[PDB]
Amino acid sequence: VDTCSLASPASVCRTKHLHLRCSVDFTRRTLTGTAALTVQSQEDNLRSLVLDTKDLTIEKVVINGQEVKYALGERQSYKGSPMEISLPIALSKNQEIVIEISFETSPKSSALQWLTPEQTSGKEHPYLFSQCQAIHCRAILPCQDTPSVKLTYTAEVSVPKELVALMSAIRDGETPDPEDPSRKIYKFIQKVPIPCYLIALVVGALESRQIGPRTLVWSEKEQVEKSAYEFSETESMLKIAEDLGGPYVWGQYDLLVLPPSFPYGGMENPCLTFVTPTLLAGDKSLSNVIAHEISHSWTGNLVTNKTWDHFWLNEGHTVYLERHICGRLFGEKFRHFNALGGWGELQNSVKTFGETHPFTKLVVDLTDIDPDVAYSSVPYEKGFALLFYLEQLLGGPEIFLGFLKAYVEKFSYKSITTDDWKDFLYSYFKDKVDVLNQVDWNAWLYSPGLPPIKPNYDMTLTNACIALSQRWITAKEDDLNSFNATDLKDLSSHQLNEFLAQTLQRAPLPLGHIKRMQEVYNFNAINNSEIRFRWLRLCIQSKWEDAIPLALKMATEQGRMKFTRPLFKDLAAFDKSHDQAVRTYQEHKASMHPVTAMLVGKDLKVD
């Protein structure tokens, strides 16, 4: 059962298609229109059905050209309000009908962020973007907001004519709005059935540049050139992913570089991956995020978790494919370096939550839990560690990649559970069932903490990071003069980031050590968001007051939760910056993404 949805389950009825006709009103901060759902009954004598909604105003529901009765139930916190619709005629099993709902969103819709012109790069036009994963589609339109249902969709979006709309779909033309010549209607078609969390919309002063045979990069004019260069390896990564997963079925693979408040590193919206502008490091070093979103075109978008309790299926397999893409491009020693880095992030998550915390389990129980509050590196890295351990146990990467491809082929266009995955793993590896039976399945899937076995990792690229981190940790005052810029001469940006992560695991360090690190390495000059984030956390945790303005600026000038949440938490934990962190959150709260504002408030204990 999907404990995060209040809608009728897939066993009662299934939405097959959505035809959305809407208009974006920037003056009211509302999306208004009609959602026409083609719904197929799965039961005999079906007379009503329930949809998910959250802060939606319903004007009317039309079936067969006439208004029908509906009722909105009491709100159930983050789940929203159930909408029960009374069907005019009882449906037989497999009968399909179209239900047209006229609705309008709330300006406080948790799916949307409305930006004023001052919040954009161009400063002249406003901007809107959505983020539906996990359960925010219900805050845009009435739907069965569960990944256990997959539907196709078509959309027609009216916007001010100076702006551009894009969606997680193939572009299907644009025309002036026949009802208003100051507006344009943009059309879209998504012919591959998707779960509704993959519905996405952006409206803004967007420009595009072609960077591959099936890829345009989209952003405001000021970021086009930098984005085209940053993401130039996209076609190469798509070709490797097709070799590992099978055909790319989505047609286009475009990228949208969002404003800095985009809450995630990337969102795998089909046909149009959304990415944070914090990837714009200038040297392509953060391109693993693109490899990750590309990989979701198979693991997540084609094979999907049936409920959010099985989210690790989506992320674990995607991290596994992501690391194979980067291993093909940069070598097997690089794949192991990134895999070992991932184990260290899993160590940090388990330490943060606590080793017995229910969110450190691979398969979770989200009954009465807001998915946004559960979100962490555990499903990604505990999921990856299980697959990497099975790869080692079952004969290596070539053999395990055969399983991955067969798994994608088996479950394409379906929504599955951990038991479906395990049953297929046992079926595919029938000649190695004795090896599979040695796995402690109960501990790996259902127990909290670090996994029961740590995989084997090549240490070649990690050794220099560990050695430099240990030199700093073990240094006394009289050793500080031995450090010098030459210590970093043979380290890649990835290795500098790993040196900082290793050191941050032992923070705090003495203030004099951190001051010496800035003296000889000049980490304050580095703009790479991952390195800067770890360096500023190391400074703040080591109680360097000089870092307070730098950390507050990074926390507020961008809104990627991976960076903003720990920076605000570190600033709140440092007595010297505590009041400033709380005051800065209070002043920026109204202008923040709604989910990020909620999570930073919980982290800071500010209501």
Ligand SMILES: N[C@@H](CO)Cn1nnc(-c2ccc(Oc3ncc(Cl)cc3F)cc2)n1
């Ligand atoms: N797909 C990403 C690129 O890797 C981008 N991304 N955007 N939004 C989200 C997201 C995903 C899941 C969430 O809830 C859960 N968290 C953890 C669990 Cl074990 C189950 C859950 F339901 C909440 C949000 N992920």
Ligand SMILES: [Yb+3]
């Ligand atoms: Yb067309």
Ligand SMILES: [Yb+3]
């Ligand atoms: Yb079986």
Ligand SMILES: [Yb+3]
């Ligand atoms: Yb000494």
Ligand SMILES: [Zn+2]
């Ligand atoms: Zn992902």
